[PDB]
Amino acid sequence: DMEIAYPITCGESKAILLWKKFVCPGINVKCVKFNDQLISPKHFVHLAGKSTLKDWKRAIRLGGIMLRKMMDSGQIDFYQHDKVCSNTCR
């Protein structure tokens, strides 16, 4: 079908989050398309220059809002988070 996704940013860098690939705990999961390469949020954040924050969920933004908040709202949280979790996402 279609690849559900969301446009995201980090610093002045733009990328695309493939939502169904966004699986807990997300940090090292290849779910971000950046320059036609599928990479992890940790790598995207590093390349965007925000690794010094030590909080990828706050470094990445969706519509200007910290990804952390969109995740906490339940509207854009990890795919199938209620059943698939590492217990280290918090």
Closest CA to 12 of 57, 50, 43: 50
Query: Which element (helix H / strand E) includes 67?
Result: helix 67-72
**Residues 16 to 35: which contact Zn ion by CB under 5 A?**
24
| Distance in Å, CB of 55 to Zn ion, minimum | 16
Query: Which element (helix H / strand E) includes 33?
Result: strand 32-34
**Residue 10 is assigned to a ligand binding site:** no
Amino acid 53 reads L
Per CB under 5 A, does 85 bind Zn ion?
A: yes
Residue 24 or residue 48: which is nearer to Zn ion going by CB?
A: 24
Residue 89 phi, psi dihedral angles, 5° rounding: -70, -15
Site stretch for Zn ion (CB under 5 A), options 42-50, 51-59, 60-68, 82-90: 82-90
Which residues of the chain form contacts with Zn ion (CB under 5 A)?
24, 85, 89
